[PDB]
């Protein structure tokens, strides 16, 4: 009741990933919660419902939605008479983050936004009036969104405009708002180039990118990831978006990004990664097994012909479906990272973090 | 100072001290231009200095000159950020520029003192083209009572390798000149490779005389160490992705700037990736390539 | 059983009063500790008031389960907030606090053993016993902690 | 009293370093060196920071020359020197520190430094002692801080390869094994087969462990998912001075692109580059390799028993220290904020 019930695991997991949770999109957490939304703020409940159903996806979109929900929560916050805001607000936000984690494991951008908000709340003087503190917190969140995402995207687009050349063939993977904005602004400014969109099952997010590239008038080819080795002879540049950059330089991105980096290296093609500095992390990963997300295994079912293979796959005791979400590209496979600070080597992630931490 | 007087001053500075680096001479000429400037605003001085840097880069197309000009521009910008009054800003600029010249006049000694301890006794050193910094490092190693052999590439088409060989023979060091094509043949003899650098790019790689990239590749194939010696003023904010990503103004000389004896106007510099570099010996110390980017990330922003 | 009582008479400490605490948990604002001399009431060692030099992680200097000598810098008896600083504690003050805590813990152990012998079952009985014996000496000598131990030492002989 | 005991303790420490060292670990070595330096600061008479630094350097030179392979003593001496420099600069009116001490392009462009330690401040000693006490407190928990990151680098049913006996790696693995199941393969690290002990302790914790000789490292590496090793020293470029046979293990891991994780605390970082100095390896008696009972065969055979191996930074994937995870390419920064370049050569 007071604690949200834990989400149930869907089915059998791969033995190498048995430490990670595996959830079903159909089984939502709101089945055993009060509809007037007492325990958890209604904005957080709606946000978690949108997370668990895949309605909101992408690092920037998830971070922005979380920050807006947190603004709504702060606006409706009343300090207890025998408590201080700096402690009570931080203590109150924790069950909300636990519920959001239960709905879907938090992205790196969401984690960094949560840390920033907690630091901002803690640094509120006890003498400040409640409404003044709430207005300051909302203004801080607005500034965070404006500077860490929007202005950062504009600066990254301006920096990446220099790398794109006339006659280039740029290979992009999946859906990334930063990459799409970079390509659209490069096309608008006068650069002429082709884009090859590589997509993969089951999300097929690359189609999103494809649609945008046609609305902007950019010529675009489309193919699946297994055919990448066929198309890379034509490709002159690979441009990838990153969900996170780890302290050791590794790029944590959608599964298959490291595959594309490896094949591009085998084909002697430069690989560039676009990421905002607000998504840099102090964690380190050496592989995709230690920390990852296991999506719904049922998404791996496909309709080929009349029959459906893998239908009722749980009836086979030895059959496991592995719907990996993320993967880790080692820094040796990445040639360049474009951030709002400029073009940096993949090994400059730890220093940038330091530069962004001495201020705070 | 006008353009002609700037060019004359730069050339005279180079001529008076043959050992003086091109970037150092360019920085000294820029400081003289700052001293002789008549403007009373920061933006006018910045525009005049940018024009002077363009003139000097037209005179000399080396990456070192451009990096020195960019460093001087960043120096005046840093001086202007702290101080709002232009008179005090110019006075502090002149004093700190004199101190800057005095400090960077001693970079080679520090580099030699740091690097000469990496040359094992009874070892073979492979070198590409001519480099005053490498010459100073080998002088320091000899003065430390170390015996070693040197292989030097010819470094076509200017044959600076023979000049380096003569300079090393002046120091009584066994030096053998090999062809460029023979580099892959001779790598199995060299214990280590020491080369200079005309510029250190953001990622930690270098832009050097043509033929350095293949030397680095051959060294990586045989797992030989690859050492670069370069001063701090050679750090540039460039990020080439391949050989064609290097700006054309650096590949082809100042006076220089189909399908039948074309020769495509042979480039003078190429880019060596940081993965082929073991260590750098700068006046800031012994660094990994990844440190180089740090020195720039802290310099700006 | 779980009989417990404050070492001193007053239920709360005062500002600029070095106290012994036991680190219990790590939080964002600082380390949540329990005041050993005051029946294990919650307090917070602030992250800012942890070291004179810049500190990157609280775990660098704070270990869960380790006793500490911290100076109280803010008391709010209404909300129940006690703020503690480790930077302002001098080594001599730490030694004095350690000695005082040792003496007070010896007195508390003596009184708790007496209560256990008398088969006391409620904390009120232990509080009354402290009122009769220890705190009388404490406010007779005008020295909390030291007075009770000195009076107990004056006994036997 | 002061001198008669301080000199005796210094002599005892130097003699212990010269001959043996006992079962003392690296943490114990660092703690004893810090205590020695604290007593030197407290007892000896020094007017300004310059005299104190000269005296500390003089003692550290002898302590280091006692046993060059024991780099923890020199690391602690240089840490204390950097602490003295920081405190003096704080009392000398220089505002922020740890950035102007190191040579920097921005510092070079925007001015410089003119060092002078002649001034006397009465509060310098208390500040230095407080900083040393903070250092000791950090030492008391560095191992726990390293072990607390175990679950972030080990997944279920993973095969982890280790060489030798490292207490840090043992604590790391034992912390990981509380919530995870994995299989550990330990190389014996001949001739001092300490790995055997490493395999026994890991066996007492219920971890499925396997022992094998150093000859089978490459053969078994094909089925090993991760490599976790300790080290004796971390050089200024990210290289390792580890137990012998670690270079072979690193090469085998690099062949299969297996990640190599080094679990080493902060005090093992040494600002000495592997240029030369002919003092890297530590050659113990050849009795361990070839027994004395071989006979006349020993009068014409050259037996060498190096103890340590040099591992270049290219073969290392990650450094796990009490401050978290870092790449070998960032180690230089951890140098600059721990040691001063003028204190590299004692």
The three-state DSSP-derived secondary structure of A302-352 is: CCCCCCCCCCCHHHCCCCCCCCECEEEECHHHCCEEEECCEEECHHHHHHH
Distance CA(D45)–CA(D42), nearest Å, equals 8
**CA C104, CA C109: separation in Å to the nearest integer?**
9
Query: DSSP H helical segments within D20-148, as ranges?
Result: 26-43, 49-66, 71-91, 105-109, 124-147
CB-based touch C/B (3+ pairs, under 8 A): no
Is chain A adjacent to chain B, meaning 3+ CB pairs within 8 angstroms?
A: yes
What CATH code would you report for D147-337?
A: 3.40.50.10470
The tokens for D231 are 């080290």
Is the CB of A35 inside 8 Å of chain D's CB atoms? no
How far is it, in rounded angstroms, from Cα D279 to Cα B71? 40
Rg (CA), chain C: 17
How far is Cα of residue A274 from the mean position of the Cα atoms in its chain? 13
Q: Answer whether A332 touches B (CB < 8 Å).
A: yes
Q: Are D240 and D234 in contact (CB under 8 A)?
A: yes
Backbone angles phi, psi at D264, to 5 degrees: -135, 135
Sheet holding A220-224, edge to edge: A220-224, A193-199, A168-173, A237-241, A271-274, A336-339, A342-344
A158 touches chain D (CB under 8 A): no
- Tokens of residue A199, six digits: 């997509």
Q: Quick one: tokens of B192? A: 């280590």
Interhelix angle for B42-59 vs B63-82, to 10°? 170
Yes or no: say if C23 and C62 are a contact pair by the CB < 8 Å rule.
yes
CB contact under 8 A, D105 and B298: yes
CB nearest C59 (choices: D86, D133, D145): D145
All residues of chain D having their beta carbon less than 8 Å from the beta carbon of residue C51 are 134
- Whole-number Å distance between alpha carbons of B163 and D342: 36
β partners of residue A306: none
Q: Which two tokens stand for residue B94?
A: 């002149």
D152 contact A CB<8A? yes
B115 alpha carbon, distance to own chain's centre = 16
**Distance in angstroms (rounded) separating the CA atoms of residues A186 and A160:** 8
Provide the phi-psi class of D233: left if phi over 0, else alpha when psi is between -120 and 50, else beta: beta
Domains, in order of start, for chain B: 7-110 (1.20.120.1070), 111-299 (3.40.50.10470)
A336: left (phi over 0), alpha (psi -120 to 50) or beta: beta
Show the beta-strand stretches assigned E in chain B.
123-127, 148-153, 175-178, 192-195, 206-209, 226-229, 269-272, 279-282, 285-287
Within 8 A by CB and 6+ apart from B233, the residues are B23, B24, B27, B64, B67, B68, B71, B104, B107
Of the residues A284, A292, A324, the best mutation for testing chain D's interface (the one with the most D CB atoms within 10 Å of its CB) is A284
User: Is B118 close to D237, i.e. CB distance below 8 A?
Assistant: no
Task: For residue B1, give how far its alpha carbon lies from the nearest alpha carbon of chain D (Å).
Answer: 24
The resolution, in Å, is 2.7
Breaks (C-N over 2.5 A) in chain A follow: none
Strand, helix or coil at C21?
strand
Nearest to D156 among A15, A285, A331 (CB): A15
Q: Parallel, antiparallel, or unpaired for β A336-339 and A342-344?
A: antiparallel
Burial of B16 (0-12, 13-18, 19+ CB in 10 A): exposed
Write down the CATH number for the domain with range C17-91.
Answer: 2.40.50.140
C67 φ, ψ (degrees, to nearest 5):
-70, 155
A275's tokens: 């990421």
Distance separating alpha carbons of residues A197 and C110, to the nearest angstrom: 79
The residues, any chain, with a CB within 8 Å of residue D42's CB and separated by 6 or more, are D125, D129
Q: What CA–CA distance (Å, rounded) separates B4 from B133?
A: 30
Name the closest residue on chain A to residue C55, using Cα atoms: A358
User: How many Å apart are CA A70 and CA A53, to the nearest integer?
Assistant: 20
In contact, A21 and A52? CB cutoff 8 Å: no
A36: number of Cβ within 10 Å: 6
Which chain C residues are closer than 8 Å to D88 by Cβ? none
The whole-angstrom separation of Cα A176 and Cα A205 is 9
Please give the backbone phi and psi of residue D235, each rounded to the nearest 5 degrees, phi first.
-80, 175
Reported in sequence order, the residue ranges of chain C that DSSP labels E, i.e. its strands, are 18-26, 30-35, 41-46, 67-76, 81-85
Closest CA to B231 of B280, B194, B283: B283
Indicate the domain borders of chain C.
Answer: 17-91, 92-157
Burial of D179 (C-beta count, 10 Å sphere; 0-12/13-18/19+): exposed
Beta-carbon separation of C29 and A90 below 8 A: yes
Q: Strand D308-311: give its sheet, edge to edge.
A: D233-234, D240-243, D308-311
Instruction: Report residue A56 as tokens.
Output: 């909101």
Against chain A, the chains showing at least 3 CB pairs within 8 Å are B, C, D
DSSP string, B24-35: HHHHHHHHHHHH
Query: Residue C52 corresponds to which tokens in the numbers above?
Result: 């004179």
Q: Tell me, what DSSP letter sits at residue B235?
A: B
- Architecture of the domain delimited by C92-157: Orthogonal Bundle (1.10)
∠ CA D344-B103-D92, nearest 5°, is 60
Q: Establish whether the linkage from the previous residue to D191 is cis, with ω within 30° of 0.
A: yes
**Which are the contacts of C39, defined by CB distance < 8 A and separation ≥ 6?**
C4, C5, C6
Q: Which residues, including other chains, have CB under 8 Å from residue B68's CB and lie 6 or more apart?
A: B22, B23, B24, B26, B27, B30, B233
Q: How buried is residue A286: exposed, middle or buried, by Cβ count under 10 Å (0-12/13-18/19+)?
A: buried
Task: Report which of B109, B106, B21 is spatially closest to residue B67, judged by C-alpha positions.
Answer: B21
Per the DSSP assignment, residues forming a β-bridge with C109 are none
Q: How would you label D290-325 residue by residue, b for 16+ Cβ within 10 Å and e otherwise? A: eeeeeeeeeeeeeeebebbbbbbbebbbbbbbbbbb
For strand A336-339 and strand A271-274, is the pairing parallel, antiparallel, or unpaired?
parallel
CB D139 within 8 A of CB D31: yes
CB-count burial class (<10 Å; 0-12, 13-18, 19+) for D21: middle
CA-to-CA distance for A298 and A318, rounded, in angstroms?
Answer: 16
Q: How far is B24 from chain A (nearest CA, A)?
A: 26
CB contact under 8 A, D327 and A289: no
Tell me the CA distances in angstroms from D140 to B95, C45, C59, D55, D231, one per residue in order: 49, 19, 11, 27, 19
Nearest residue of chain B to residue D101 (CA atoms): B284
Contact criterion met (CB below 8 Å) for D62 and D77: no
Exposure pattern of D240-271 as b/e (b: 16+ CB <10 Å)?
bbbbbbbbbbbebbbeeebbbbbbbbbbbbbb
Categorise residue D168: left if φ over 0, alpha if ψ from -120 to 50, beta otherwise.
Answer: alpha
């Amino acid at each position: 009741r007071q604690q949200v019930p834990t989400r149930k695991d869907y089915g059998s997991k791969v033995s190498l990933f048995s430490h990670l949770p595996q959830y079903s999109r159909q089984n939502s957490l709101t089945q055993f919660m009060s509809i007037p939304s007492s325990v958890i703020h209604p904005a957080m409940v709606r946000l978690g419902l949108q997370y668990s159903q895949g309605l909101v996806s992408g690092s920037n979109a998830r971070c922005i939605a979380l920050l807006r929900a947190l603004q709504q929560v702060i606006q409706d916050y009343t300090t207890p008479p025998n408590e201080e805001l700096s402690r009570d607000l931080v203590n109150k936000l924790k069950p909300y983050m636990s519920f959001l984690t239960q709905c879907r494991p938090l992205s790196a951008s969401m984690h960094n936004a949560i840390k920033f908000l907690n630091k901002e709340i803690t640094s509120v003087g006890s003498s400040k009036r409640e409404e003044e503190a709430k207005s300051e917190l909302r203004a801080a969140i607005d500034r965070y969104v404006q500077e860490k995402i929007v202005l950062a995207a504009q600066a990254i687009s301006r920096f990446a405009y220099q790398k794109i050349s006339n006659g280039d063939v740029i290979l992009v993977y999946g859906c990334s708002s930063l990459v799409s904005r970079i390509l659209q602004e490069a096309w608008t400014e006068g650069r002429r180039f082709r884009v090859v969109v590589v997509d993969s099952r089951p999300w097929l997010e690359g189609r999103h990118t494809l649609r945008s590239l046609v609305h902007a008038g950019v010529p675009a080819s489309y193919l699946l990831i297994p055919a990448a080795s066929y198309v890379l002879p034509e490709v002159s540049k690979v441009l990838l978006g990153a969900h996170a950059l780890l302290a050791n330089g590794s790029v944590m991105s959608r599964v298959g990004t490291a595959q594309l980096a490896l094949v591009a290296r085998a084909h002697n093609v430069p690989v560039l990664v676009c990421c905002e500095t607000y998504k840099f992390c102090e964690r380190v990963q050496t592989d995709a097994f230690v920390s990852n997300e296991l999506d719904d295994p049922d998404d791996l079912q496909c309709k080929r012909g009349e029959h459906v293979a893998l239908a009722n796959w749980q009836n086979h005791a030895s059959l496991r479906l592995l719907n990996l979400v993320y993967d880790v590209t080692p820094p040796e496979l990445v040639d360049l990272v474009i951030t709002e600070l400029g073009m940096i080597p993949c090994s400059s992630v730890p220093v940038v973090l330091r530069v962004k931490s001495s201020d705070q | 100072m006008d353009d002609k007087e700037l060019i004359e001053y730069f050339k005279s500075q180079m001529k008076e001290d043959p050992d003086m680096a091109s970037a150092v001479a360019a920085i000294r000429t820029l400081l003289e231009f700052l001293k002789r400037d008549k403007g009373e605003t920061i933006q006018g001085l910045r525009a005049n200095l940018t024009s002077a840097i363009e003139t000097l880069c037209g005179v000399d197309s080396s990456v070192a000159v451009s990096s020195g000009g960019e460093l001087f521009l960043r120096f005046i910008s840093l001086a202007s950020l702290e101080y709002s009054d232009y008179s005090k800003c110019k006075k502090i600029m002149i004093e700190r520029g004199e101190l800057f010249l005095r400090r960077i006049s001693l970079s080679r000694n520090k580099i030699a003192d740091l690097c000469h301890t990496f040359i094992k006794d009874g070892a073979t050193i492979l070198t590409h083209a001519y480099s005053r910094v490498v010459l100073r490092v080998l002088e320091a190693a000899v003065a430390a009572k170390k015996r070693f052999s040197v292989y030097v590439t010819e470094s076509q088409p200017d044959l600076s390798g023979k000049k380096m060989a003569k300079a090393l023979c002046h120091l009584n060091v066994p030096v053998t000149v090999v062809l460029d094509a023979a580099v892959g043949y001779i790598m199995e003899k060299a214990d280590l490779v020491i080369v200079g650098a005309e510029g250190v790019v953001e990622n930690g790689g270098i832009i050097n005389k043509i033929g350095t990239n293949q030397m680095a590749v051959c060294a990586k194939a045989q797992n030989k160490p690859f050492y670069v010696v370069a001063e701090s003023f050679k750090f540039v904010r460039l990020f080439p992705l391949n050989q064609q990503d290097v700006p054309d103004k650096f590949k082809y000389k100042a006076d220089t700037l189909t399908g039948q004896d074309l020769k495509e106007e042979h480039p003078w510099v190429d880019y060596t990736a940081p993965s082929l570099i073991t260590l750098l010996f700068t006046d800031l110390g012994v660094l990994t390539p990844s440190a180089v980017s740090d020195e720039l990330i802290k310099l700006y922003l | 059983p779980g009989l417990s009582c404050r070492f001193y008479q007053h239920k709360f400490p005062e500002v600029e009063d070095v106290v012994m605490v036991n680190v219990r948990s790590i939080a964002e604002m600082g380390a949540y500790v329990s005041l050993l001399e005051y029946n294990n009431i919650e307090g917070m060692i602030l992250l800012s008031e942890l070291s004179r030099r810049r500190i990157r992680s609280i775990n660098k200097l704070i270990r869960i389960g380790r006793n500490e000598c911290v100076v109280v810098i803010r008391v709010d008896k209404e909300k129940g907030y006690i703020d503690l600083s480790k930077r302002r504690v001098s080594p001599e003050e730490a030694i004095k606090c350690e000695d005082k805590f040792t003496k007070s813990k010896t007195v508390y152990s003596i009184l708790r053993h007496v209560a256990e012998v008398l088969e006391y079952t409620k904390d009120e009985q232990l509080e009354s016993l402290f009122q009769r014996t220890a705190w009388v000496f404490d406010d007779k000598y005008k020295r909390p902690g030291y007075g009770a131990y000195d009076a107990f030492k004056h006994a036997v002989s | 009293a002061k001198g008669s005991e301080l000199s005796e303790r210094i002599e005892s420490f130097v003699e212990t370093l010269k001959r043996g060292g006992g079962p003392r670990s690296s943490e114990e070595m660092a703690r004893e060196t810090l205590g020695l330096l604290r007593q030197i600061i407290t007892d000896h008479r020094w007017s300004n920071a310059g005299e104190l630094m000269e005296l500390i350097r003089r003692e550290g030179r002898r302590m280091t020359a006692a046993q060059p392979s024991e780099t923890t003593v020199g690391n602690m001496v240089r840490r204390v020197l950097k602490i003295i420099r920081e405190e003096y600069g704080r009392l000398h009116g220089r505002s922020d520190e740890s950035d102007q001490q190191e040579s920097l392009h921005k510092l070079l462009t925007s001015g410089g430094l003119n060092e002078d330690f002649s001034f006397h401040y009465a509060q310098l000693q208390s500040n230095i002692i407080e900083a040393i006490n903070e250092l000791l407190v950090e030492l008391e928990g560095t191992m726990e801080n390293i072990a607390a990151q175990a679950l972030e680098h080990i997944h279920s049913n993973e095969v982890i390869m280790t060489i030798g006996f490292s207490r840090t790696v043992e604590a790391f693995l034992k912390e990981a094994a509380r919530k995870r199941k994995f299989h550990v393969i330990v190389a014996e690290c001949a001739p001092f087969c300490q790995g055997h002990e490493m395999a026994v302790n890991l066996s007492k914790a219920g971890i499925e462990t396997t022992v094998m000789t150093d000859a089978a490292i490459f053969a078994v590496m094909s089925r090993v998912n991760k490599v976790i090793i300790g080290t004796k020293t971390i050089l200024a470029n990210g290289a390792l001075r580890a137990v012998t046979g670690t270079h072979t293990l690193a090469l085998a891991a690099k062949h299969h692109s297996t990640p190599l994780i080094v679990c080493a605390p902060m005090f093992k970082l040494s600002p000495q580059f592997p240029n030369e100095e002919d003092s890297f390896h530590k050659f113990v008696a050849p009795e361990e390799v070839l027994p004395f009972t071989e006979g006349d065969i020993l009068e014409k055979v050259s037996v060498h028993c190096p103890v340590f191996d040099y591992v270049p930074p290219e073969l290392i994937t990650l450094f796990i220290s009490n401050i978290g995870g870092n790449a070998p390419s960032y180690i230089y920064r951890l140098m600059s904020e721990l040691y001063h370049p003028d204190d590299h050569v004692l």
